[PDB]
RNA sequence: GGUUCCAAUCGAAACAUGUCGAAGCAUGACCUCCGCCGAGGUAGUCUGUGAGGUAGAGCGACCGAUUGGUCCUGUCAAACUCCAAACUUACAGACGCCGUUUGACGCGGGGAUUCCGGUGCGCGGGGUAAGCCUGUGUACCAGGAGGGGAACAACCCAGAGAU
RNA sequence: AACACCUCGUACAAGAGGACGAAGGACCUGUCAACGGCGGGGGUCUUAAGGUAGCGUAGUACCUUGCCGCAUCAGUAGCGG
RNA sequence: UAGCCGGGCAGUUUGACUGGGGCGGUACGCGCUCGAAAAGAUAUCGAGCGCGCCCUAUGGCUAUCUCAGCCGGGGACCCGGCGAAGAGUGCAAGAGCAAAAGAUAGCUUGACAGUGUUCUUCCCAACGAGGAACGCUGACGCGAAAGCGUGGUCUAGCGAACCAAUUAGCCUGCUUGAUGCGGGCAAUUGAUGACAGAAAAGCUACCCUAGGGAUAACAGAGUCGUCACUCGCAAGAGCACAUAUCGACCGAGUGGCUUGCUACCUCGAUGUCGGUUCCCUCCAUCCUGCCCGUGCAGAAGCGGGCAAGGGUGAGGUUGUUCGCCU
RNA sequence: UUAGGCGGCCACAGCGGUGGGGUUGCCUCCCGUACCCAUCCCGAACACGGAAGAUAAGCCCACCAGCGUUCCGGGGAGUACUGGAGUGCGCGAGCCUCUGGGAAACCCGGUUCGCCGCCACC
């Protein structure tokens, strides 16, 4: 890498598709979830608040509850634990 | 400078005209011969000359063996015979050379080459039954000025 | 760039909104006699002075805000962190 | 439309119904929602909750089944607003719902409107709703006074199918006063 | 540059962050030893729920290149994409393997060595090239005998207590 | 600049400021058989001036075995211009 | 005792990176695309290019509204139509945004104080400053209200300890009280760009030591761009005639004499260039033997084939190798 | 849903087009400014009050595939590319066999002129 901010190499993964541009529904943003619950983790590229660092892009965490309104949910990157703030806009329920 | 240097497709594709400043202009005169008026279907016999190993071919190449192709269908047949050739490629991939060691190597730029896939028809001619042994004879001195080996092909002619 | 000489905000103080007034600070006299000034006396004699021998840093090419903000009721001030600028100029 | 790299907008928003910057900012409260709508002869109130598939509708009132307890004028006025307002408030207090946030959809917060009369009447009815009252009508505007001094500059009859001649505000507090009791059908 | 007896168990690193630092150190990674915890673990595969734009392709799908003729006709892209793999990867179940006297996973502490690497294969970037320079994934040499290859660190077989 | 003196400060002192002002410096002048300099452009500019007698391919000239002549069969040498 | 001058003398410093070192440059602190091999991570003096600010509005909320561009009617203005985004949004690049994140208007100072959770900085995996997301307490702005405002749509715009100045309150100074003047808890501002922070110029051929083939000159070795020689095609000219002869362009090679590149071998030493003497060899043949063609009358040539038995000498300038001259 | 309101998925729903439907019912157009409210100028809009008229717009219903989009068949194609293995081939750039996966363009033919949830209503 030339440099080393957060949104490198992040051309592909932080952009929206042609046909999903534009504003996205509500409905997901305001969705509700439950302590132990698993849950996908991916930025909308449409949605500016409430994002993670993009390194976890693609990883499956568990809810262990809230600061406000976004979520606390436990990853593990490698082998280390770590707990990411996120907001359901970015959250997808798994299976 | 030596084909040598340039015949291996050995690097990425270096075509990005708005990252490239500087770029030789190509030596290749005209890519339709013939009568372009006229049309391709208008012919009874198509011969295309076909390349057998994947190489690049410099500007400089397809000048020399296009010149002394048509330069002999222009013999045999005229300033204005029955006919119509057509060189298929363009010199798309731009070329570098290091002309201080191999420190700060990067070499700058030196001209242009058109990439050609073995199996592909780098040239295209359309002309009638008589014309027909002149056609290949044209393509025997294009095939001698170029890299690769290659098949004199005729597609549609079972006038043989 | 520009800078309103008097506005609303809160005051730390009353611990409410309130007007206050911006002001440069102006750099206070040295008195000569603290804890630091005694030891370049002492320290310093034959040959180099270590520390005390030292001449004065450099510049960056730009400092940040120096600011006092004053409330119009109570009368008490307020520092706040700065922010690189080139030059301030007050409003009225 | 044009091809493959278009984009069509949301359904409800090529219908020009549902102002969605609007209505994620409703539903990030958590409350029911409370729908005021209108129409060029009637009044409508429902109370909204999210659900899965869509919104559910707990509870709702229109102008129209407003006679059903009295009424025998027109409906698409002040007096008609804030009684189905109370209405669907009452109903909604029976199906155990509480609260619930203001929804215009896309009409505008003029001072003193209908919408804000629906808001009132579900307010008397019990439910707890986050308004202002110096927003609201003055209370004599909304019984349907300001139509009877109208029909005061009389010389030719206001109502055409025949309620009455002057009108009656009073015909609006003696429905007022039906809703209020205990026993009435909801 | 040198540092003097025998054997048994385990067994590296030639890399990352900071350094007047690059012939050196410290902190991590990795090797080893001790104590603690007490039931799961996940090197392989299958399936389910997610992540992705490289190969290839195509461009009247954007973008920038690149032909000729009186719609048709000729060509491209590391810093283009209407498309799109193999494959890599998060979590979970199942099977396999493993652990509960060989205590796994994990936690805490003592001790290091190490921070000149090299080669084959795959994918690379630079360079006319190189027994070149510089990345990456993997196995090997280094520290790997014995059999084969005329000889021969890393190519083939093969990992080896004695008889 | 320091001492002395004056103001403020301190029951005193530390300290702050002031008045006066030596050599030195600014400023001006003299001096190159003093260090050194004597160009580019055009028919002035840098930075003061812009190479005079002489000598010159030099033990100093890259181009260079410069060109002409002497001398030799032939002279990157040597001497003369 | 004070100010000026002061290499006469003394002690020291005068960085690192780097296809050896110096010169050049900064890949020495930061941001984006590509390199990067469709998770994450990834080098080179790798390709394209930026940041060390600017803004009191170019910050914030609310209301009202929809832009480029093209068409039609009266490249300023007015009316209508088409027009999902190509406009605009401070500055690189990539990404976001249309009843808005854009435009206009009006109002406002949340660019607010206090204290945290988390991620990043530093993938995995320890490490500061700095940064961001998301909370809580306090006080406010706007809106009917949900709500939005912890600066600018997102990723660059940054700085330790010691010392000084500054902000508000409080602790403290040797038996004790009063005064003066000090020491301290929290925090803001002042620079170290060699950017996880020393206060810092050169020469040595008079030289010296420790080491290194971890690194250059010379020789060897790899390569062969350069150099030497060859071949394919044959445009062309040669009074006509491509191929007696000369022979461009383009294309394919062989050698290891020149040159360049690399850093494998040697720095506890493989003695330099040129010359000389004396020995062996190669053929891409200068002569001599034997041949083929000719633009071969002859004679003298010119070009080509086989062929390494023998031969290939003397002198003038210059150290010269080379080369010029008799 | 014989015309309604709030939605989820967010073009299978877009673009364009044909036909049909409403007396005190519904939704509209519609009619009109004393009031609440409104236009940097206009009751155009926003807002309020109301039914003389209309189904021509919108809306709801049935339907057409020319463009755009979703999926599917056959063909392209087990082609291009590719994960594991080889004392297989080639001077070499490179190719091939075995094993496990597997495309895009394009042509032809179907499909698609939205689906689903809640509430109210002849
Ligand atoms: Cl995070
Ligand atoms: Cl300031
Ligand atoms: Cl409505
Ligand atoms: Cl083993
Ligand atoms: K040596
Ligand atoms: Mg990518
Ligand atoms: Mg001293
Ligand atoms: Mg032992
Ligand atoms: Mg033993
Ligand atoms: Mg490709
Ligand atoms: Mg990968
Ligand atoms: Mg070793
Ligand atoms: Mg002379
Ligand atoms: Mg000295
Ligand atoms: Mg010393
Ligand atoms: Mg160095
Ligand atoms: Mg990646
Ligand atoms: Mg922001
Ligand atoms: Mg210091
Ligand atoms: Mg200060
Ligand atoms: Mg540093
Ligand atoms: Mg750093
Ligand atoms: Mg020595
Ligand atoms: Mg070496
Ligand atoms: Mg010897
Ligand atoms: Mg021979
Ligand atoms: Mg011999
Ligand atoms: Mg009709
Ligand atoms: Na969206
Ligand atoms: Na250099
Ligand atoms: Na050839
Ligand atoms: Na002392
Ligand atoms: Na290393
Ligand atoms: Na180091
Ligand atoms: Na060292
Ligand atoms: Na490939
Ligand atoms: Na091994
Ligand atoms: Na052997
Ligand atoms: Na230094
Ligand atoms: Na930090
Ligand atoms: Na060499
Ligand atoms: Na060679
Ligand atoms: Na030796
Ligand atoms: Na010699
Ligand atoms: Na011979
Ligand atoms: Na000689
Ligand atoms: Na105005
Ligand atoms: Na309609």
Redesign the pocket.
């Known amino acids: ?19 999903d ?3 996205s ?4 943003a305001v969705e509700e979830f439950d302590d132990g619950e ?1 849950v ?1 983790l ?1 930025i909308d ?9 993009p ?1 976890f ?4 965490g568990t809810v262990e509850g809230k ?4 979520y606390k949910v436990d ?6 634990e ?4 996120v ?1 359901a806009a970015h959250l ?1 329920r ?2 | ?5 340039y ?14 400043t500087g770029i030789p202009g ?1 030596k290749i005169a005209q ?2 011969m013939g009568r ?2 006229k049309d391709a279907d208008d012919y009874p016999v198509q011969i295309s000359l076909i390349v057998e ?2 190489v690049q071919l ?1 500007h ?2 397809l000048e ?2 296009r010149l ?1 192709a048509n ?1 002999h269908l222009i013999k045999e047949l005229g300033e204005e015979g029955d006919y119509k050739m ?1 060189l ?3 010199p ?1 991939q731009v070329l ?3 002309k201080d ?7 700058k730029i030196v001209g242009t080459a058109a ?1 050609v896939q073995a199996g592909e028809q780098l040239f295209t001619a359309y002309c009638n039954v008589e014309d027909a042994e002149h056609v290949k004879e044209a393509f025997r ?1 294009a095939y ?4 690769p080996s290659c098949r004199i092909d005729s597609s549609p002619a079972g006038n043989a | ?4 000489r008097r ?4 005051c ?2 009353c ?3 309130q007007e206050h007034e911006v002001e440069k ?1 102006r ?10 000034d005694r030891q370049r006396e002492r320290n310093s004699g034959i040959g ?1 002075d ?2 005390f ?2 001449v004065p ?10 600011l ?1 903000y004053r409330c119009g009721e109570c009368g ?12 301030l100029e007050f ?1 009225e | ?14 219908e ?8 994620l ?2 539903l ?2 958590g409350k029911p929602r409370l ?1 005021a ?6 009044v ?1 109130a ?1 109370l ?1 909750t999210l ?1 899965p ?5 707990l509870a ?1 009132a ?1 102008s ?2 407003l006679a059903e307890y009295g009424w025998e004028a ?1 409906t ?3 007096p008609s607003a804030y009684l189905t307002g109370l209405l669907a408030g009452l109903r909604a207090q029976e199906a155990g719902v509480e609260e619930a ?2 929804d ?12 804000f009369a629906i808001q009132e009447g579900a307010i008397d009815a019990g439910l707890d709703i ?3 009252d110096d ?1 609201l ?1 003055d209370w004599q ?1 909304t019984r349907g006074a ?2 009877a ?2 029909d005061e ?1 009389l010389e030719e009859p ?4 025949d309620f009455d001649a002057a009108d009656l505000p009073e015909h609006f507090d003696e429905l007022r006063e039906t809703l209020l009791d205990g026993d009435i059908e909801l």
């Open positions: 890498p030339s440099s080393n901010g957060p949104l490198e190499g992040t051309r592909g993964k932080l952009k929206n598709k042609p046909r541009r534009g504003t529904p509500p409905q997901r698993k996908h991916k590229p449409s949605v500016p608040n409430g994002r993670f660092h390194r892009d693609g990883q499956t600061q406000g309104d976004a990853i593990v990157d490698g082998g280390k770590k707990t990411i703030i907001t997808r798994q299976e | 400078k030596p084909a040598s240097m015949r291996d497709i050995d690097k990425p594709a270096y075509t990005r005209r708005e990252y490239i190509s890519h339709k372009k008026q190993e994947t410099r400089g190449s020399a063996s002394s330069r057509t298929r490629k363009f798309h570098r050379e290091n060691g191999m420190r700060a190597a990067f070499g990439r001195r001698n000025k170029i890299t | 760039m520009q800078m309103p506005f609303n905000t809160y730390p103080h611990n409410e909104h600070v750099s206070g006299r040295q008195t000569g006699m603290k804890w630091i180099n270590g520390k021998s030292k840093g450099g510049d960056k090419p730009t400092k940040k805000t120096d006092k008490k001030a307020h520092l706040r962190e700065g922010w690189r600028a080139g030059r409003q | 439309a044009t091809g493959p790299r278009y984009k069509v907008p949301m359904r409800r928003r090529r020009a119904r549902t102002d969605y910057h609007q209505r900012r409703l990030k409260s729908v709508r209108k129409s060029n002869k009637h409508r429902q909204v659900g598939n869509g919104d559910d509708t709702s229109h129209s089944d027109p698409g006025n002040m946030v203001l215009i959809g896309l009409n505008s917060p003029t001072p003193g409107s209908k919408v986050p308004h202002n927003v009508a505007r300001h139509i001094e109208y500059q206001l109502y055409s199918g």
